Design a protein around this ligand. Sequence first.
Ligand SMILES: CC(C)(C)[C@H]1CCCN1c1ncnc2[nH]ccc12
Length: 167
Amino acid sequence: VNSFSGYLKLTDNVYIKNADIVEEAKKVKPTVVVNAANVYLKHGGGVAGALNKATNNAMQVESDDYIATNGPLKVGGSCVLSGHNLAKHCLHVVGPNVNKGEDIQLLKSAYENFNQHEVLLAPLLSAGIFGADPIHSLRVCVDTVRTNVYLAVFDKNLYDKLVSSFL
Ligand SMILES: CC(C)(C)[C@H]1CCCN1c1ncnc2[nH]ccc12
């Protein structure tokens, strides 16, 4: 039993809700919140910009030190950093950005990072400003993640479409 509330159950391990991931994280304080990161951990917009803003830019400060030490992530890769005021940890995961021409096959590799964590609050990888089809992202999530994932979908219209079209 966990404290996530109001989710629709899609499969044994995947749950979905129309919610602002920032507000969800502040309420639940999950062990792991997933960020829709880029390889530079530059949290300018989309989910990343919103999460970073909620940390008063502390996420960006920590991220800049991480990159200065380690260099950029790989597309499809991840790193674990602090969750600041939002969660215990933030798993920064880089899905392919279609608006940069990146290979959509890397979306499965991106979701594999979730399997290193028993429970996560997450957005749909590569959705929104990353330019992928969110219906496809949900399919890859369900077919790749085996741990317990609670998906927050900001757009109510998109949420209804994802549920109504889910196979
Ligand atoms: C559901 C959308 C397709 C709109 C995705 C893609 C881009 C960001 N977005 C978010 N998702 C969940 N919580 C969020 N909080 C702020 C943004 C945001």
